[PDB]
Amino acid sequence: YEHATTMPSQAGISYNTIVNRAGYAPLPISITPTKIKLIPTVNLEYVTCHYKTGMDSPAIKCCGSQECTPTYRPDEQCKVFTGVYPFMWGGAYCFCDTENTQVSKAYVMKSDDCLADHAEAYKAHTASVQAFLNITVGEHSIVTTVYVNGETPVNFNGVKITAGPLSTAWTPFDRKIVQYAGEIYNYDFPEYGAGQPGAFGDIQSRTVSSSDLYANTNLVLQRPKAGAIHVPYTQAPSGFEQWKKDKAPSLKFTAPFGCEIYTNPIRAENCAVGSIPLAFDIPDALFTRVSETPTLSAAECTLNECVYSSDFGGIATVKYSASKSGKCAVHVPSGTATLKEAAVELTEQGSATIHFSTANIHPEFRLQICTSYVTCKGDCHPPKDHIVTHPQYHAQTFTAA
Amino acid sequence: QVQVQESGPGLVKPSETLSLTCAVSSGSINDDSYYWTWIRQSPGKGLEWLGFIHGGTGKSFYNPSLESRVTISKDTSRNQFSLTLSSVSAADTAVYYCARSHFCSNTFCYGWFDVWGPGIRVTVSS
Amino acid sequence: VVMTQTPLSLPITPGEPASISCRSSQSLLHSNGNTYLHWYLQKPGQSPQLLIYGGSNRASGVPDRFSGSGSGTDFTLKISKVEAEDVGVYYCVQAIAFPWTFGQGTKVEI
Amino acid sequence: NEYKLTRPYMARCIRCAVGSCHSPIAIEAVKSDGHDGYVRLQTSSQYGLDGRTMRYDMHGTIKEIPLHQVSLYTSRPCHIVDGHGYFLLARCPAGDSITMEFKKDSVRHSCSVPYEVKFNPVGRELYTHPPEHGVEQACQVYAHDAQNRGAYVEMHLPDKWVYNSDKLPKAAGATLKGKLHVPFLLADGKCTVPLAPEPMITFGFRSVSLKLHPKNPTYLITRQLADEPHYTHELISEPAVRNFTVTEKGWEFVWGNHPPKRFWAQE
Amino acid sequence: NEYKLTRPYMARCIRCAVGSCHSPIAIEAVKSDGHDGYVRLQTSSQYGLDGRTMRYDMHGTIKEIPLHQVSLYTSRPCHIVDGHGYFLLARCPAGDSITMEFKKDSVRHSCSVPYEVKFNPVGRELYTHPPEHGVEQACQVYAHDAQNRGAYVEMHLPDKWVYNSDKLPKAAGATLKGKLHVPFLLADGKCTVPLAPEPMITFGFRSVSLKLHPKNPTYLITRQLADEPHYTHELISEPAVRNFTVTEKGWEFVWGNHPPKRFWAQE
């Protein structure tokens, strides 16, 4: 038999529904999401890290005349200077006053530490939503992982369960993502070949172990001073450092719907948003009729102690006289309450207690045992602590008074 | 996975400060959960334990019989591992080995040592 | 601390089980529920590899042709079916109190 | 091998303790980008075994001092952890210079260099000296392995090899070049980050009140668990009272290196 | 006794010139809450007469250096003043740490600890190093007398006594306790505080104009002498020109460590 229910995407919380056929006995379905994931499709664009201004040595000639050999290093500058290494007692041990010639060459390579201090730039799309469930469909216990694309079913003991789609189509992960030290940031990183100096992207390798990097670091070879041999250069500060010391906080500290962002398997776990639909196909075997269950019993409910808190405040008490001393399903078809359990155990001619939650000052909720519609009614005292750490176990309609 | 070799001289003259070493070939000495040991074998005596030391938080542990004259040390700069035995004797002619210990997530790593090096013979002779 | 291994040697022809015993001075059981015992296999020309620790715990890259057990001080290493490559020496080994003393060595050959 | 194959050079320093000179302890490179104050230096000396000493060059004759007579400082002193090849590893605080010096049997020799050693604390309690005890987080620290992880630097024959420095020219006989490993790489690990005092949390109707008494500048990160995050991110050094509104949806609270706490109201 | 019965110990310091280890020169306590830079330290090593020496614990054996080889530094070097027991009195400036160190034959020993040494200037001219000359106010500085004043700290046998430290555990045989005195308590006295330059005071119709030319940050405290005081507190470093209104009810002010001056207007 088929059933089309809806589950608020919110981990840690149970969902106790029932399947009640017009002639056969009920079936409690307790499904509890332990984790609910949100995994984007990540496509690499480039990587980045600090730079290291490599400095090929001076090529000096005394009373000389040099020429630059064009090399193709990243941001390969090159120049020739005249006059700067004047006489003996002038560093280069040259004889001359002018027409001594230096050739300087400075390139920009990636740091020696770029294997384990580097940011990864990413383009995201196409969230492949996913989840972990703890499931009980007719006295079973399963810890299955589930995709909530509506084409990938699971099967336990004859049942077929299919979850999704349309989990509100939301993502926190913007189109442009940066990964660094486990933290994820929504930065508008420039493409491979548009990176400017003093910004994230001054060094751009396609991979961390590619053969070519792009360096736009604003390097300008300068003129040396006598006294000793050297190669000067004015260069910009790295944009890695500057993004680092001025970045905003991470997406784990700026995400809405309470998302928890995680690592290289980029994912937003536990986003309290949307509702995942569940579609069932239950067989008739684990669907037994009444003849092995207790039945109508002249039951009467009372609401002993009610508080309209976020948690299981209320206690209901049902006084019955039933045939068999066994098990019954329990449920409230309305959103006027939410019960802890799905399985009550009726004795022969006793009473039974039911811990539940609710949000109304005047509850009147159609409580159910195996086939009966008992009706609890009462009043609810207000609560004792108006900040808690246990989230909502009810529905919150406009039903205060 | 983690090869180990051993070095040091042979015929050390009696009544002197003997010394040996041992390298960690393709492996970590500065790691926790592994301790490094020194073990000798004398002819007809059977094997014998001397001492060890932990990699990280490297404080040593010796045998009280020759604690007066045994010393184990370490050099992270070379990833090497050492032994210095003062005031040698005649019966100390033995084969010296150095050993690694298993990942000590349990109290079974005590004594439960693993990948070795070949060995170094030491004949305190003239 | 002192520990005796029995017998000194053990001749055998293959296709049979075997059993070797070790008597330790003090009870090698510990208050934390652990029998500290190790059994080293020494082949000819190599350093001691292992078969059975903990009194009854096998090693990782070991065949299933072994077992062991014991109580407090009287411990037994049992072999199931001896092969040709089992020739060497067995060492009983102790670790609960310094020194980490080892066994005298039971020589095994066909 | 390095120490049995290479040779150190003399090179230009700004301040050789009396203006400039050609210094045996020239500083080619300084790296202070790791977290907890480790710096890596690339000198014009070598550090070998014969047992950790410093071999330097002085007018052809190659010299030798121990490593304990060497002394380097930025704004306070430092503590040499290790030396290997041309490179050196230390524990230095922040300053606008690195200086190094030793003393033979006469006037001292030194070299200073403007490189901004930067203390880069770990976590959300900005500190200046690292803590006795605390929680433990990821930290990339200039490691103590002198083993070849993949980095390299170039060098050449001019009898012995010498670094391809910007403070020395290039011969014309033959560029017999070669590459030697950069030790003291930046590796992962676990470092002990501090733990601020427990925040005082006074409730109220859809309101949290936060009395905070920090030992050091601690970041505070608060947001909501709703469609509109409202993320507040402030550095706090003085004692403070910060009040926030907390709906039935949620309100997340992160004080320093503590874990995240969550609160939501009820009628 | 006095004392001849105690023993030093080894203990955890964060930093010991190679990472962490057990240190002879740990720092259990630092107190820096006096006025003119005095700090008291409490270590894992003793100070006595056999002349002023330092008996430290090391791997069972007991050692002895003098107290001219010891060196402690926070951000600038310190100058030890005295030592007694496990305690030490110094003149240290402000920093964010206390390091301490020395050197036997070849090894250097160190211990650094994060404590916020602070220079708490006396008076109303916030200085950093005290002046050559000035007026004399009331100060409390960690004194040099080592007599028994009333302060005590605990210790015990495990042959010799040992401090009841957080970094040593407790014995189970017998808790034979006792108490020993802390010298160098914070006592009163008279200290020399700088005197700012003379303020220039131009007159005007029911007004005063103060031209102020300070050498260092200084408090200007003005009030009216009437039912509505209007107290103006300011810290002043730049040369300033502040104009105040002055009635027949009166107006007084205070410039740094000067006395209060009362001005009164008329028609």
UniProtKB/Swiss-Prot annotation, chain A:
Signal sequence, renumbered to the chain: none
Annotated stretches, region: E1 fusion peptide loop: 84-101
Membrane topology per record: Single-pass type I membrane protein
Post-translational modification: N-glycosylated.
Glycosylation (residues): 134
Subcellular locations according to the entry: Virion membrane; Host cell membrane
Residue ranges, Extracellular side: 5-401
Disulfide bonds, paired cysteine numbers: 49-114, 62-94, 63-96, 68-78, 259-271, 301-376, 306-380, 328-370
Chain's role: Class II viral fusion protein. Fusion activity is inactive as long as E1 is bound to E2 in mature virion. After virus attachment to cell receptor LDLRAD3 and endocytosis, acidification of the endosome induce dissociation of E1/E2 heterodimer and concomitant trimerization of the E1 subunits. This E1 trimer is fusion active, and promotes release of viral nucleocapsid in cytoplasm after endosome and viral membrane fusion. Efficient fusion requires the presence of cholesterol and sphingolipid in the target membrane.
Subunit structure of this chain's protein: Interacts with spike glycoprotein E2. The precursor of protein E3/E2 and E1 form a heterodimer shortly after synthesis. Processing of the precursor of protein E3/E2 into E2 and E3 results in a heterodimer of the spike glycoproteins E2 and E1. Spike at virion surface are constituted of three E2-E1 heterodimers. After target cell attachment and endocytosis, E1 change conformation to form homotrimers. Interacts with 6K protein. Interacts (via fusion peptide loop) with host LDLRAD3 (via domain LDL-receptor class A 1); this interaction mediates viral entry to the host cell.
Annotated protein name in UniProt: Spike glycoprotein E1
Species this protein is from: Venezuelan equine encephalitis virus (strain TC-83)
Lineage of origin: Viruses, Riboviria, Orthornavirae, Kitrinoviricota, Alsuviricetes
Portion held of the full protein: 813 to 1213 of 1254
